[PDB]
Amino acid sequence: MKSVITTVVSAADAAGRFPSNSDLESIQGNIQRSAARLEAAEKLAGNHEAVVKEAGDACFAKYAYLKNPGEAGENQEKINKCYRDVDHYMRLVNYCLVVGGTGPLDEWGIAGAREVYRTLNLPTSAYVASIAYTRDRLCVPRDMSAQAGVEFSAYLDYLINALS
C-alpha cells in the first residue's frame, strides 16, 4: 500500500540503512495534514447515502443509451448492480483519504481495471461522468473547507487520469 509512512520506510530497508532523520522529517509532514484531511473522510462517510443517488443518476443523464436494450444496462437488475459498482470507488476514497496515499486505489481500484472493462464491455467513459460530477458539484463554503477542496478534489483527479 502507498502512504507517507510505508513509502519512506521501504528505502530504509531496501538500501539497508537505519531509519534516518530525513524519514523522521517525513512523518512530521503527515501531522500537518492529519487534522486537515481526515475531516473529509468523516464528511463523506455520513454523506454517501444521498450522493450515491445523485452521482449515480449523473451518468445516465449523459448516457441514456445504457438503459437501452442490448447493452450493459439492459436490466433493472443491471442498474441495481451499477449503483453498487460506483459504491466501491468512493468507498475507497474513504479508505484513501484516511491513510494519506492512493494505496487503497492503486492496488484495489485501477490494478486490472482496464482488462475487466474491455472483456465485459463496461464503458469507462461513464465513470468519468459518475464521480467527476461530484467534482463539478463541490462547494467550498457550504460543504467542507478548502483543505478538503484541495485534497478530496485531488484524489478524484487521480482516478479520471487512471480510468482513461
Partner: protein, 56 residues
Amino acid sequence: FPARIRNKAPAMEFRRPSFANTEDPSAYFMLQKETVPLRMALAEKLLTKLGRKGDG
C-alpha cells in the same frame, strides 16, 4: 434469453411478379431481422374492449 437477444425476430416482405409466366424485375423479397416493439397503442383498445380497467 439474454439481454441482447430478447424480442428479436425476422421480418419479411413479398412482392410477387405482375403477370403469370413472365419475368419481372420489380419482384423483390426482404428478409430483414427486426426487433418487435412493445406496441402499447393497440394494447389499450384490446383490454378495454374485453374486460375491465387493467390498472394494477
